[PDB]
Design a binder for this molecule. Structure first.
Ligand SMILES: *[C@@H]1O[C@H](CO)[C@@H](O[C@@H]2O[C@H](CO)[C@@H](O)[C@H](O)[C@H]2NC(C)=O)[C@H](O)[C@H]1NC(C)=O
Lengths: 49, 216, 216
């Protein structure tokens, strides 16, 4: 798994509760041989959501 | 600009038989993603153009399954499995890759029939028109097929140029032939300066050119 | 079924501006998927401009840049073109071609309007001059309808009783800006002395009503 963690905002650090609140989005990349396809066999589709 | 060319310029067809038209570009229309941006359009007589095939092989929704398309990066073909009488008109190929998008010259399709030669007539200007100071000489080519014909005006055996206009009727349903008029416009003074007026007609149904002329 | 309805025909003069609308019903159209295609008289289709999702802004042909504005309104399901500084060569039938769901970097035009005729002419409303085309075993005669503006003219023979063999040619636009056509009919040569032949010419803009007897 190729991992990237991007931080958008540091909301607060609550000293009383000792809690850090952050807004992030995780970048996760990996290989799945079962979901392997060629664009040429499907009309040039390079991406599927 | 990419230049689109088509072949044939006219395709006489027969209902109940296959047909094929071709288009060619001077640049490759292949896209980076692997599809060719070539669309085919049909303009029936009197109607707006209709899309038949888009991106060189995909049939548009609502198009009859007879029409099919294919091609390579530079050469493309449109085929009709079985021609119908409703398939007559001008077929246009269009490249949709590079701005400005360009249409082809167009290929005309019409019902095939036996070669009929034109019946040629010439009409001198009326005295009523000469009263107004102008003169029109009309050469008529009646009920001929195919459309391809040539009319040349001779004035005392001198070929004319730049002073005649041409008008063609649509293929009539019954006879399946075309009719043509060529009108030579001259001033009354220039009209009176010559003696023999003639129109020379060439058509593949004629063994030799047919001349009709009059003497003033 | 989806229908595109364009604005009415327009009579314009050189230097003016014309705005053509293209309203859709029976379907939902957006900010893209609009292309305008003109067809000059006796010429092929020609792409003028359009809006594609890729440019998110209209793109025009080099012939029309600086003169043409293309817009599409999703909220009211209509699109417009505005061609300014009109020329005589801008005379054509202007079509709108649309797709409900636009292609990213091309266009198909599944839905077409009926087309609008824009005529850029400095001429004035004027009636025709009707001249006979006198007959010289079938004989040909006709009527020359010359120098009128605007279109159309309707021609019948013997008050509509004579229809067989009648050919009324499409009008030709002359360099003077006025139209001209001929209407002709082939008849037996034996009937020239016994049967009367009259062409009934009507031009509504001038209220011209002529019944011209054609005889040798
Ligand atoms: C196809 O034809 C067009 C038009 O002739 C070519 O585009 C022109 O290329 C010349 C290059 O000498 C330029 O000077 C012109 O400005 C271009 N545009 C036009 C409208 O003439 C195009 O290159 C040709 N394609 C190929 C690959 O032959």
């Amino acid at each position: 798994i190729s991992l990237k963690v991007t931080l958008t905002n540091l909301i607060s650090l609550n000293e009383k509760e000792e809690t850090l609140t952050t807004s992030v989005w995780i970048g996760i990349d990996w290989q799945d041989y079962r979901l392997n396809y060629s664009k040429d066999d499907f009309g040039g589709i390079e991406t599927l959501r | 600009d990419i230049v689109m060319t088509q072949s044939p310029l006219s395709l006489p067809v027969t209902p109940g038989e296959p047909a094929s038209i071709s288009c060619r570009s001077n640049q490759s229309l292949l896209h980076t993603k692997g599809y060719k941006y070539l669309n085919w359009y049909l303009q029936r007589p009197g109607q707006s153009p209709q899309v038949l095939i888009y991106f060189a092989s995909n049939r548009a929704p609502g198009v009859p399954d007879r029409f099919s398309g294919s091609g390579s990066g530079t050469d493309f073909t449109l085929k009709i499995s079985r021609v119908e009488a409703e398939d007559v008109g001008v077929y246009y190929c269009m490249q949709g890759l590079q701005i400005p998008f360009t249409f082809g010259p167009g290929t005309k399709v019409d019902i095939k029939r036996t070669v009929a030669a034109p019946s040629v007539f010439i009409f001198p200007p009326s005295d009523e028109q000469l009263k107004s100071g102008t003169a029109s000489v009309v050469c008529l080519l009646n009920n001929f097929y195919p459309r391809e014909a040539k009319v040349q005006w001779k004035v005392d055996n001198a070929l004319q140029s730049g002073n005649s206009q041409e008008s063609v009727t649509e293929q009539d349903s019954k006879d399946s032939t075309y009719s043509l008029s060529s009108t030579l416009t001259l001033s009354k003074a220039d009209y009176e300066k010559h003696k023999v007026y003639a129109c020379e007609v060439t058509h593949q149904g004629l063994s030799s050119p047919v001349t009709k002329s009059f003497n003033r | 079924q989806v229908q595109l309805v364009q604005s009415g025909a327009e009579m314009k003069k050189p230097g003016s501006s014309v705005k053509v609308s293209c309203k859709a019903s029976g379907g939902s159209f957006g900010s893209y998927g609009i292309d305008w295609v003109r067809q000059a008289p006796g010429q092929g289709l020609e792409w003028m401009g359009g809006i594609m999702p890729k440019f998110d802004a209209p793109k025009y042909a080099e012939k029309f840049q600086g003169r043409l504005t293309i817009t599409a309104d999703r909220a009211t399901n209509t699109a417009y073109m505005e061609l300014s500084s009109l020329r005589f060569e801008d005379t054509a039938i202007y079509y709108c071609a649309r797709d409900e769901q636009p292609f990213y970097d091309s266009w198909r035009g599944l839905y077409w309007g009926q087309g609008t005729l824009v005529t850029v002419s400095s001429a004035s409303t004027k009636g025709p001059s009707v001249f006979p085309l006198a007959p010289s075993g079938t004989a040909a005669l006709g009527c020359l309808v010359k120098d009128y503006f605007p279109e159309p003219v309707t021609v019948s023979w013997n008050s509509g009783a004579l229809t067989s063999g009648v050919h009324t040619f499409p009008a030709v636009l002359q360099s003077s800006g006025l139209y001209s056509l001929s209407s002709v009919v082939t008849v037996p040569s034996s009937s020239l002395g016994t049967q009367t032949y009259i062409c009934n010419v009507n031009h509504k803009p001038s209220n011209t009503k002529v019944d011209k007897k054609v005889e040798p």
